[PDB]
Design a protein around this nucleic acid. Structure first.
Ligand SMILES: [Mg+2]
Ligand SMILES: [Mg+2]
Ligand SMILES: [Mg+2]
Ligand SMILES: [Mg+2]
Ligand SMILES: [Mg+2]
Ligand SMILES: [Mg+2]
Ligand SMILES: [Mg+2]
Ligand SMILES: [Mg+2]
Ligand SMILES: [Mg+2]
Ligand SMILES: [Mg+2]
Ligand SMILES: [Mg+2]
Ligand SMILES: [Mg+2]
Ligand SMILES: [Mg+2]
Ligand SMILES: [Mg+2]
Ligand SMILES: [Mg+2]
Ligand SMILES: [Mg+2]
Ligand SMILES: [Mg+2]
Ligand SMILES: [Mg+2]
Ligand SMILES: [Mg+2]
Ligand SMILES: [Mg+2]
Ligand SMILES: [Mg+2]
Ligand SMILES: [Mg+2]
Ligand SMILES: [Mg+2]
Ligand SMILES: [Mg+2]
Ligand SMILES: [Mg+2]
Ligand SMILES: [Mg+2]
Ligand SMILES: [Mg+2]
Ligand SMILES: [Mg+2]
Ligand SMILES: [Mg+2]
Ligand SMILES: [Mg+2]
Ligand SMILES: [Mg+2]
Ligand SMILES: [Mg+2]
Lengths: 233, 34, 87, 66, 124, 154
RNA sequence: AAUAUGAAUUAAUGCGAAGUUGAAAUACAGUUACCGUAGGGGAACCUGCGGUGGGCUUAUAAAUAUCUUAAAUAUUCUUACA
RNA sequence: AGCGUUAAUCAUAAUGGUUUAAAGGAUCCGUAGAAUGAAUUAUAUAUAAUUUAGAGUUAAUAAAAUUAAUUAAAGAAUUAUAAUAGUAAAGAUGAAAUAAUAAUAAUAAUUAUAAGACUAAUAUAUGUGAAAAUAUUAAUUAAAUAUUAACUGACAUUGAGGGAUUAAAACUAGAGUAGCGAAACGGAUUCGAUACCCGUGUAGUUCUAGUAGUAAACUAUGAAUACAAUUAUUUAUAAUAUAUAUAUAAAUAAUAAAUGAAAAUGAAAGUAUUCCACCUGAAGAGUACGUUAGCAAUAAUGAAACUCAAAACAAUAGACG
């Protein structure tokens, strides 16, 4: 798609018309558009930092900047093949955003498959409003999950209570586990209490599941009989 | 050259070949001893 | 595995969408009867009810009972589902 | 959340912040500034008594558009 | 079309007109003697009976010359002057006998365009 | 070299066509001079030395250790949906190199076709090499330098 | 020795005239057409051998799809609430 | 006081082109080039001394088993001959016949010998080769990729003339000859049938040594270098903490821009630079004459007269099949 001249040069085209006398009366938008000009400078702008990491895009490590011996003990005395190629496309193609937390997230859900079954609302509430002190895991607006663990790990890393990342992660995991156990106990005891004081639940979860299975089975059975009849004949 | 245009050339070439075939004995006579 | 991307086509459509219906009941009964008559001689009373059932089925007409919108979806969704590069 | 890495019009390169989850992510400070500029022009034509026309062919958009 | 190629003989083809009347030998007219005088059938699609003639010029080469005007006066030996026109419908005749001069007489009772034929001014 | 200069001109044109902001060029003296001249006339927004990978923030001295990887980064320029540096046709091509006296250059400036050069235009810039120093043709005339008519930007 | 003109007889080719014999080519042109080459035939042509597409990219399904508070809660909300 | 006309001269488009309209050499190699060609500094476009980015050399480490030439093997079938038992048709075609078919005992079947020539799958000619080409196996000799390390220090690009290789057919020798198959003969088909179909089937197709140097030798697109916006596929390289998601290249497929008569081209048919080849209306003509080369067929070179205002391409809408 070619860069369209005629979408942004509107006021100029109308100004010409007004000058001529093709237009008797000025549009409502004319003064407003004059006041607030369009961009009209549709450039490819280069980028020098990856925002997520903070790696430098533009720079090249020199031969003089690498004085000491390489892996396999060879001193770099020349530019290599890649150091001669003009790496301009890297300045322009947008950076792949990388986070240390992503790896931790991946690890957590590998270690805890059934944490995936806990449903996750992705529809954000005000991201600016929140204010979580990761001294502890249990934040108010946020629920208990692997995310909270990871945030705790990051906090530990920052504060240097656990200098190592792995140890901090383990600690966060252990904090999480206790909380989870407590949550589990809460629900069961609440259920027990309800049972004791004459509460009545019409459909339990397992009963519901059985009912759901039953309809499917009924559907299958009629179909299966028809298929058997088909096969016979 | 389209195929149609080529066909005129082909025809010409065929005619030439025919002429050569006709004038073989005559050509032989002309060639030897002069 | 080996993916196969098509070129830009004029119109994605199947030329004959099958709407694989179930086979006819009357025909089935007739086949069953035929199978029974292969055994048990010509017309023994093992297939006494089967013949009656067939007759009941094929009383009003020779067959008892008398399309898939598939190329209404292909046509709809071709432009989306393309990996056609931008304009 | 921009379209996708494979559905990229490179004309829009300046606006995009980076890529993540196989999706281009739109620079949001830029978005903000453009929105403000747009908002100001919308205000101006309304003040002048111009005819503003909101066009939205997608499914759920109707009620909010109205 | 490279600069070197241009230097060693290459460029636009200079369109040096070409001689419409080669047998005339780079001169306005030539005298000739008629050999025979014909009536030619024109090309498709236009039909008439064109009063052409064959003429041996003074330079030597023989030429099929057209004879314009109504009725003409040309035998098998007449002195005739040839000029470099072309009868367009008759193929293979690229000349005109100029009509006022020689044994070819001026075309009779000609009122319009008299100098184009032999016709003198009638003089009231 | 003149072939190099032509290549950089072509590259500049290409970059103008697609609207890139910041563009690399080979790091030679002639090329650098040319770039500086463009900058001063006002065709480039920026001019800075750097690596093959990008423009340099700090100063890095150029040596045999670097030279092969060294590069000249150049900012292009746009206004009202139109690029400033539209064209970069050179005049003295490698095969037919042309060297004008001061009179010929003056004539060119004042709207006279010379040696099959279209005489220089309203918003144009003809660069002229004179003793391994690139100048504007007007500047060369003022100084009175018989020189090679290098190239033409518009 | 080279050049020019002439030569009985003879060949090619052009233009006109639309006669005869076929119907080779253009559509799957009724045996795909053309390139090179070889042999054959009144004439277009026919046949062998390899090549080419300037002919077939003209390309277009063996079918089945899933469970959480269906509402006193969602659906209403017009700068309110907080 | 000339006006016409004829004969002439100058102007009137190269501020051109060659996939499909005239026009890329079959391909590479390489000589001349009064063709073009990196970096820095200093001398008064050159010299000089320094550079390593082009172009090379040799290692090391990965890969790959391809292309030549040569030698040695494998295989399904085919035809022919013979035997076995067995019975009247067999083979062919649109349907039929003719024939080294068959009551001399065939065809089909089962065996057993021989002979040539071909190479099913894998296969995409993917890839590899300068192009012609090139897929049964093995061996030999030759050449080949990438990245590193070191070295050379512009040694390069292109390439008139020249040189070498160059499908199929053809030719000259000497072998070979199953199948196929120009020609020829015969049978059909048809008004006719010097054809299309069928049958005998010679040159030829095969090898060895040569000649010759052309093809729709086509991507109908000469080679080289610098550059320009995306996506998807594979392939290889490196890192990653061997299987992940990343950075590179390379190819292939869709495009942006740009170019374009359009069809469409898409890292070139774009933006530029260099070098070579070639074109300048159609017919006549790649013809004649001449010359060179060839055993020859022929190949290259390559005119003019005569005659027209035509001739050609992309696309459009019909009609037609
Ligand atoms: Mg476009
Ligand atoms: Mg052509
Ligand atoms: Mg008069
Ligand atoms: Mg003599
Ligand atoms: Mg004679
Ligand atoms: Mg007839
Ligand atoms: Mg016919
Ligand atoms: Mg047919
Ligand atoms: Mg026909
Ligand atoms: Mg045909
Ligand atoms: Mg035919
Ligand atoms: Mg024949
Ligand atoms: Mg053939
Ligand atoms: Mg072959
Ligand atoms: Mg071929
Ligand atoms: Mg065709
Ligand atoms: Mg086609
Ligand atoms: Mg001129
Ligand atoms: Mg070629
Ligand atoms: Mg070369
Ligand atoms: Mg090549
Ligand atoms: Mg095979
Ligand atoms: Mg032989
Ligand atoms: Mg035959
Ligand atoms: Mg042979
Ligand atoms: Mg040879
Ligand atoms: Mg030939
Ligand atoms: Mg050719
Ligand atoms: Mg394509
Ligand atoms: Mg162009
Ligand atoms: Mg073109
Ligand atoms: Mg010849």
């Amino acid at each position: 798609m070619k860069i369209q001249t005629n979408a942004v040069n509107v006021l100029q085209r109308t100004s010409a018309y007004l000058k001529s006398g093709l237009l008797k009366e000025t549009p409502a938008w004319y003064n407003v558009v004059a006041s607030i000009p369009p961009s009209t400078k549709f450039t490819r702008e280069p980028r020098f930092k990856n925002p997520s990491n903070g790696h430098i895009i533009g720079k090249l490590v020199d031969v003089t900047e690498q004085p000491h011996a390489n892996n396999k003990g060879l001193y770099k005395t020349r530019p290599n093949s890649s150091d001669k190629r003009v790496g301009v496309k890297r300045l322009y193609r947008p950076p792949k955003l990388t986070y240390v937390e992503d790896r931790l997230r991946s690890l957590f859900y590998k270690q805890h498959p059934w944490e995936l079954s806990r449903p996750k609302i992705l529809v954000e509430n005000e991201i600016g409003d929140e204010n979580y002190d990761w001294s502890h895991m249990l934040q108010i607006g946020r629920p208990l999950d692997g995310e909270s663990v990871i945030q705790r790990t990051m906090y530990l890393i920052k504060t240097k209570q656990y200098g190592d990342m792995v140890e901090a992660y383990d600690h966060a995991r252990y904090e999480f586990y206790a909380l989870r156990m407590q949550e589990e106990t809460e629900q069961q005891v609440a259920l027990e209490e309800a049972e004791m004081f004459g509460s009545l639940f019409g459909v339990s979860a397992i009963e519901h599941g059985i009912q759901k299975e039953q309809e499917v089975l009924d559907v299958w059975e009629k179909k299966v009989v028809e298929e058997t009849e088909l096969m016979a004949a | 050259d389209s195929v149609m245009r080529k066909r005129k050339k082909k025809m010409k070439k065929h005619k030439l070949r025919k002429r050569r075939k006709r004038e073989k004995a005559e050509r032989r006579k002309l060639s030897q001893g002069r | 595995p080996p993916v196969y991307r098509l070129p830009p086509l004029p119109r994605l459509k199947v030329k004959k969408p099958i709407i694989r219906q179930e086979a006819n009941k009357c025909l089935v009964l007739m086949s069953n009867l035929l199978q029974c008559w292969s055994s048990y001689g010509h017309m023994s009373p093992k297939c006494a009810g089967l013949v009656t059932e067939l007759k009941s089925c094929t009383s009003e007409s020779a067959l008892g009972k008398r399309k898939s919108n598939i190329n209404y979806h292909a046509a709809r969704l071709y432009d989306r589902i393309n990996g056609k590069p931008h304009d | 959340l921009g379209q996708s890495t494979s559905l990229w019009r490179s004309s829009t390169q300046s606006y995009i912040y980076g890529e993540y989850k196989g999706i281009h992510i739109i620079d949001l400070n830029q978005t903000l500034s453009y929105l403000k500029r747009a908002a100001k022009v919308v205000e101006g034509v309304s003040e002048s008594g111009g005819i503003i026309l909101f066009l939205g062919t997608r499914q759920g958009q109707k009620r909010g558009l109205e | 079309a490279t600069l070197n190629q241009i230097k060693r003989g290459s460029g636009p083809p200079r369109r040096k007109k070409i001689s419409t009347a080669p047998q005339l030998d780079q001169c306005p007219q030539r005298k000739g003697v008629v050999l025979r005088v014909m009536v030619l059938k024109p090309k498709k699609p236009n039909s008439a009976q064109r009063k052409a003639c064959r003429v041996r010029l003074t330079n030597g080469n023989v030429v099929s010359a057209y004879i314009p005007g109504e009725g003409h006066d040309a035998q098998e030996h007449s002195i005739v002057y040839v000029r470099g026109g072309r009868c367009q419908d008759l193929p293979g005749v690229k000349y005109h006998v100029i009509r006022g001069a020689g044994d070819l007489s001026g075309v009779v009772n000609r009122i319009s365009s008299r100098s184009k034929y032999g016709a003198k001014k009638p003089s009231k | 070299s003149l072939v190099k200069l032509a290549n950089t001109c072509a590259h500049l044109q290409n970059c103008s066509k697609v609207r890139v902001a910041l563009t690399s060029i080979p790091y030679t003296k002639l090329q650098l001079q040319f770039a500086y001249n463009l900058y001063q006339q006002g065709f480039l927004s920026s001019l800075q030395k750097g690596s093959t990978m990008g423009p340099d923030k700090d100063f890095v001295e150029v040596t045999p250790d670097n030279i092969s990887t060294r590069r000249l980064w150049v900012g292009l320029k746009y206004r009202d949906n139109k690029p400033v540096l539209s064209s970069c046709k050179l005049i003295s091509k490698p095969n037919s190199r042309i060297h004008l006296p001061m009179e010929d250059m003056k004539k060119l400036c004042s709207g006279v076709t010379i040696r099959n050069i279209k005489p220089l235009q309203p918003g144009e810039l003809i660069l002229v090499r004179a003793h391994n120093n690139i100048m504007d043709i007007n500047e060369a005339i003022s100084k009175k330098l018989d020189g090679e008519v290098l190239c033409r930007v518009k």
